[PDB]
């Protein structure tokens, strides 16, 4: 039972820090870089749960 | 007006093609039975479990496309009548002037 | 939970898609460039014609 | 018949641009896969006991 | 710990691999050797009696 | 169409493609 | 261990190939921006030439009674006006085409970068976890 | 194609012949699928038989 | 390094000559009855540097000869690359097989 618990917590922290890096790269949003672009059409999606 | 009509024709034709193939695929599927052939071990995988749409959303897709076509047809009819009346009036007035 | 076959297929799909995009862009470049100069030259010719007549 | 259900699903996995519609059928089919799986395991255990 | 430590992979790569099949076989072989050797321990002790 | 083109204004900055017809002096057969 | 090795090998091959394609894709995008500003400047100056052409057309209707004529000047002027109009329409269509291509390339770049990150994570994890204990001689524990 | 320019050409007939030939080929390929599946099923049968014998 | 610098200098030459072509086509284009015609100050002046034809011909041909020489060199390097990879793999395979054989003898 112990091992099961540790495995679950490991999984959670892994995905959490993955989101952390994504969102830090996100907050690095200051103007004037190249990755900014046009791909209009992101205003209809039943995406996130 | 001709341009717009042809474009919408093409789009709806496309989606109808799609529905035809999917329907025929499932028809070919359904005649299976336990004793028959076409019966194999294929392993599990998430591609089998992938999700792409939901019934109401697919329905509303179709509904929007239908209504778009309907409006364009109405507009075409209106423009047709207007053009006819203009032709008639032009002819009559030039006739009277010459008389 | 996945399949080696399908992983291999996914990779091949990705790379061929990249190639398609690149070829599209290049062949667009060529004829766009062409159209630029031909339009410019014909406009020059017409302008000269006009000024000559009115002189 | 587990094979025939599995092939049902395998064909279902081949659908074009807008056809993959998570529905009752896929849900039920998954349920039956799980059910026959547990049934097979139980039966094998009984075989060993016999 | 290897086998259930792999599953931290994400995205498109939790594939069922020949590596994992072989590792599960490994677990089974370890267990079978474990069982047989404990049984022979039992038999030797009875002989001592 | 297929008709007379003047193959003259021919510096696309980077056409490293199966393109840029007529003279190229590329290699014909490759690794394998 | 034999199979584990070739697993890592194919992963490395994937890394190398994907990195190369990324480089040349971003190169092509860098060139297409230049093409874009080229066409935009062309639009500007053709508009200016329409400006001057109209200008020259305008005044000549002020001329007094009999010397006013439907000259071949007028002929050629109206021809130029209409012709440059269709020219403008064609160029704007080409412009729309260009932005469409740009959005496509945007999706391409995003997908490639995300796949890069995922596979780097995979190789990372596998190496420093498995090769840490799994070393030489299967006697001693890796405590 | 507008008004009188709509014409019945050898191209039309060629395309139609292509379509019909194509349906025929479709059907024959499906038949081959059927027979191959039968063979596979039979071989699996004998495999199970042999393992029990072993 | 050499190839990149050669290509850039050829690029410069090309843009220069096409600008000249623009000027000269305009020169043929104009004529009398034209808004731009007038008297200009003492244009009979000879230019200062006044390049002559031999320098034209030399500057043109000389650099393209450099280019074709570099092309030859590139072909040479590619074939050498092939040969070198081949040799390395040759020694690796032969050596490992021989060592395996000696190992069997010892066992």
mmCIF file of N, CA and C in Angstrom, chain C:
data_model
loop_
_atom_site.group_PDB
_atom_site.id
_atom_site.type_symbol
_atom_site.label_atom_id
_atom_site.label_comp_id
_atom_site.label_asym_id
_atom_site.label_seq_id
_atom_site.Cartn_x
_atom_site.Cartn_y
_atom_site.Cartn_z
ATOM 1 N N UNK C 1 0.393 0.887 -23.524
ATOM 2 C CA UNK C 1 -0.918 1.479 -23.750
ATOM 3 C C UNK C 1 -1.022 1.922 -25.206
ATOM 4 N N UNK C 2 0.133 2.118 -25.835
ATOM 5 C CA UNK C 2 0.252 2.402 -27.257
ATOM 6 C C UNK C 2 0.881 1.216 -27.980
ATOM 7 N N UNK C 3 1.110 1.391 -29.278
ATOM 8 C CA UNK C 3 1.580 0.328 -30.148
ATOM 9 C C UNK C 3 2.806 0.776 -30.933
ATOM 10 N N UNK C 4 3.850 -0.052 -31.017
ATOM 11 C CA UNK C 4 5.033 0.340 -31.803
ATOM 12 C C UNK C 4 4.705 0.687 -33.242
ATOM 13 N N UNK C 5 3.816 -0.094 -33.856
ATOM 14 C CA UNK C 5 3.359 0.198 -35.207
ATOM 15 C C UNK C 5 2.846 1.625 -35.306
ATOM 16 N N UNK C 6 1.992 2.012 -34.365
ATOM 17 C CA UNK C 6 1.338 3.306 -34.448
ATOM 18 C C UNK C 6 2.301 4.438 -34.116
ATOM 19 N N UNK C 7 3.256 4.197 -33.216
ATOM 20 C CA UNK C 7 4.296 5.192 -32.971
ATOM 21 C C UNK C 7 5.076 5.472 -34.251
ATOM 22 N N UNK C 8 5.481 4.402 -34.941
ATOM 23 C CA UNK C 8 6.234 4.542 -36.183
ATOM 24 C C UNK C 8 5.428 5.323 -37.215
ATOM 25 N N UNK C 9 4.147 4.976 -37.347
ATOM 26 C CA UNK C 9 3.267 5.695 -38.258
ATOM 27 C C UNK C 9 3.174 7.173 -37.895
ATOM 28 N N UNK C 10 3.066 7.482 -36.601
ATOM 29 C CA UNK C 10 2.943 8.871 -36.172
ATOM 30 C C UNK C 10 4.160 9.677 -36.596
ATOM 31 N N UNK C 11 5.347 9.117 -36.368
ATOM 32 C CA UNK C 11 6.564 9.814 -36.774
ATOM 33 C C UNK C 11 6.550 10.104 -38.271
ATOM 34 N N UNK C 12 6.303 9.069 -39.082
ATOM 35 C CA UNK C 12 6.346 9.265 -40.531
ATOM 36 C C UNK C 12 5.359 10.339 -40.971
ATOM 37 N N UNK C 13 4.154 10.318 -40.397
ATOM 38 C CA UNK C 13 3.148 11.326 -40.722
ATOM 39 C C UNK C 13 3.690 12.721 -40.452
ATOM 40 N N UNK C 14 4.254 12.923 -39.259
ATOM 41 C CA UNK C 14 4.763 14.243 -38.902
ATOM 42 C C UNK C 14 5.755 14.751 -39.940
ATOM 43 N N UNK C 15 6.750 13.923 -40.262
ATOM 44 C CA UNK C 15 7.811 14.412 -41.139
ATOM 45 C C UNK C 15 7.298 14.695 -42.549
ATOM 46 N N UNK C 16 6.459 13.806 -43.092
ATOM 47 C CA UNK C 16 5.951 14.077 -44.432
ATOM 48 C C UNK C 16 5.121 15.357 -44.456
ATOM 49 N N UNK C 17 4.381 15.631 -43.377
ATOM 50 C CA UNK C 17 3.614 16.870 -43.320
ATOM 51 C C UNK C 17 4.526 18.086 -43.397
ATOM 52 N N UNK C 18 5.621 18.054 -42.635
ATOM 53 C CA UNK C 18 6.583 19.150 -42.697
ATOM 54 C C UNK C 18 7.039 19.393 -44.131
ATOM 55 N N UNK C 19 7.402 18.312 -44.827
ATOM 56 C CA UNK C 19 7.891 18.468 -46.196
ATOM 57 C C UNK C 19 6.839 19.109 -47.096
ATOM 58 N N UNK C 20 5.580 18.683 -46.953
ATOM 59 C CA UNK C 20 4.510 19.259 -47.765
ATOM 60 C C UNK C 20 4.438 20.771 -47.581
ATOM 61 N N UNK C 21 4.417 21.219 -46.324
ATOM 62 C CA UNK C 21 4.334 22.656 -46.066
ATOM 63 C C UNK C 21 5.476 23.402 -46.748
ATOM 64 N N UNK C 22 6.705 22.900 -46.581
ATOM 65 C CA UNK C 22 7.853 23.613 -47.139
ATOM 66 C C UNK C 22 7.753 23.748 -48.655
ATOM 67 N N UNK C 23 7.392 22.660 -49.343
ATOM 68 C CA UNK C 23 7.283 22.744 -50.797
ATOM 69 C C UNK C 23 6.231 23.761 -51.217
ATOM 70 N N UNK C 24 5.083 23.769 -50.528
ATOM 71 C CA UNK C 24 4.064 24.767 -50.837
ATOM 72 C C UNK C 24 4.649 26.170 -50.783
ATOM 73 N N UNK C 25 5.347 26.479 -49.688
ATOM 74 C CA UNK C 25 5.855 27.836 -49.514
ATOM 75 C C UNK C 25 6.825 28.215 -50.629
ATOM 76 N N UNK C 26 7.733 27.304 -50.986
ATOM 77 C CA UNK C 26 8.719 27.631 -52.016
ATOM 78 C C UNK C 26 8.050 27.947 -53.352
ATOM 79 N N UNK C 27 7.145 27.066 -53.792
ATOM 80 C CA UNK C 27 6.551 27.302 -55.101
ATOM 81 C C UNK C 27 5.676 28.550 -55.095
ATOM 82 N N UNK C 28 5.137 28.940 -53.937
ATOM 83 C CA UNK C 28 4.484 30.245 -53.864
ATOM 84 C C UNK C 28 5.481 31.381 -54.082
ATOM 85 N N UNK C 29 6.640 31.289 -53.421
ATOM 86 C CA UNK C 29 7.654 32.334 -53.541
ATOM 87 C C UNK C 29 7.962 32.641 -54.998
ATOM 88 N N UNK C 30 8.158 31.591 -55.799
ATOM 89 C CA UNK C 30 8.667 31.795 -57.160
ATOM 90 C C UNK C 30 7.734 32.703 -57.963
ATOM 91 N N UNK C 31 6.481 32.280 -58.125
ATOM 92 C CA UNK C 31 5.586 33.023 -59.003
ATOM 93 C C UNK C 31 5.199 34.376 -58.416
ATOM 94 N N UNK C 32 5.147 34.512 -57.083
ATOM 95 C CA UNK C 32 4.930 35.850 -56.534
ATOM 96 C C UNK C 32 6.020 36.809 -57.002
ATOM 97 N N UNK C 33 7.281 36.392 -56.843
ATOM 98 C CA UNK C 33 8.391 37.214 -57.303
ATOM 99 C C UNK C 33 8.211 37.589 -58.764
ATOM 100 N N UNK C 34 7.885 36.602 -59.601
ATOM 101 C CA UNK C 34 7.691 36.868 -61.028
ATOM 102 C C UNK C 34 6.677 37.990 -61.262
ATOM 103 N N UNK C 35 5.501 37.848 -60.645
ATOM 104 C CA UNK C 35 4.419 38.787 -60.899
ATOM 105 C C UNK C 35 4.833 40.205 -60.546
ATOM 106 N N UNK C 36 5.639 40.353 -59.491
ATOM 107 C CA UNK C 36 6.044 41.698 -59.074
ATOM 108 C C UNK C 36 6.652 42.468 -60.246
ATOM 109 N N UNK C 37 7.757 41.954 -60.794
ATOM 110 C CA UNK C 37 8.472 42.736 -61.795
ATOM 111 C C UNK C 37 7.668 42.872 -63.080
ATOM 112 N N UNK C 38 6.906 41.840 -63.474
ATOM 113 C CA UNK C 38 6.191 42.030 -64.737
ATOM 114 C C UNK C 38 5.182 43.171 -64.624
ATOM 115 N N UNK C 39 4.451 43.231 -63.504
ATOM 116 C CA UNK C 39 3.513 44.334 -63.326
ATOM 117 C C UNK C 39 4.236 45.677 -63.334
ATOM 118 N N UNK C 40 5.376 45.755 -62.642
ATOM 119 C CA UNK C 40 6.102 47.022 -62.594
ATOM 120 C C UNK C 40 6.452 47.507 -63.996
ATOM 121 N N UNK C 41 7.007 46.615 -64.820
ATOM 122 C CA UNK C 41 7.452 47.034 -66.146
ATOM 123 C C UNK C 41 6.285 47.481 -67.017
ATOM 124 N N UNK C 42 5.161 46.757 -66.970
ATOM 125 C CA UNK C 42 4.056 47.183 -67.826
ATOM 126 C C UNK C 42 3.530 48.551 -67.399
ATOM 127 N N UNK C 43 3.543 48.834 -66.093
ATOM 128 C CA UNK C 43 3.083 50.146 -65.637
ATOM 129 C C UNK C 43 4.003 51.247 -66.157
ATOM 130 N N UNK C 44 5.319 51.027 -66.065
ATOM 131 C CA UNK C 44 6.258 52.003 -66.618
ATOM 132 C C UNK C 44 5.959 52.288 -68.084
ATOM 133 N N UNK C 45 5.763 51.226 -68.872
ATOM 134 C CA UNK C 45 5.521 51.403 -70.301
ATOM 135 C C UNK C 45 4.299 52.276 -70.546
ATOM 136 N N UNK C 46 3.201 51.984 -69.841
ATOM 137 C CA UNK C 46 1.983 52.763 -70.045
ATOM 138 C C UNK C 46 2.197 54.234 -69.694
ATOM 139 N N UNK C 47 2.890 54.500 -68.583
ATOM 140 C CA UNK C 47 3.118 55.881 -68.167
ATOM 141 C C UNK C 47 3.868 56.659 -69.243
ATOM 142 N N UNK C 48 4.930 56.051 -69.777
ATOM 143 C CA UNK C 48 5.704 56.713 -70.823
ATOM 144 C C UNK C 48 4.840 56.999 -72.044
ATOM 145 N N UNK C 49 4.039 56.012 -72.454
ATOM 146 C CA UNK C 49 3.136 56.187 -73.587
ATOM 147 C C UNK C 49 2.262 57.427 -73.401
ATOM 148 N N UNK C 50 1.665 57.551 -72.213
ATOM 149 C CA UNK C 50 0.753 58.661 -71.944
ATOM 150 C C UNK C 50 1.447 60.005 -72.099
ATOM 151 N N UNK C 51 2.577 60.169 -71.406
ATOM 152 C CA UNK C 51 3.243 61.467 -71.446
ATOM 153 C C UNK C 51 3.642 61.826 -72.868
ATOM 154 N N UNK C 52 4.078 60.832 -73.644
ATOM 155 C CA UNK C 52 4.447 61.095 -75.031
ATOM 156 C C UNK C 52 3.275 61.671 -75.814
ATOM 157 N N UNK C 53 2.114 61.020 -75.715
ATOM 158 C CA UNK C 53 0.961 61.499 -76.471
ATOM 159 C C UNK C 53 0.644 62.947 -76.124
ATOM 160 N N UNK C 54 0.541 63.237 -74.834
ATOM 161 C CA UNK C 54 0.091 64.577 -74.472
ATOM 162 C C UNK C 54 1.126 65.650 -74.832
ATOM 163 N N UNK C 55 2.416 65.310 -74.787
ATOM 164 C CA UNK C 55 3.412 66.227 -75.318
ATOM 165 C C UNK C 55 3.197 66.535 -76.790
#
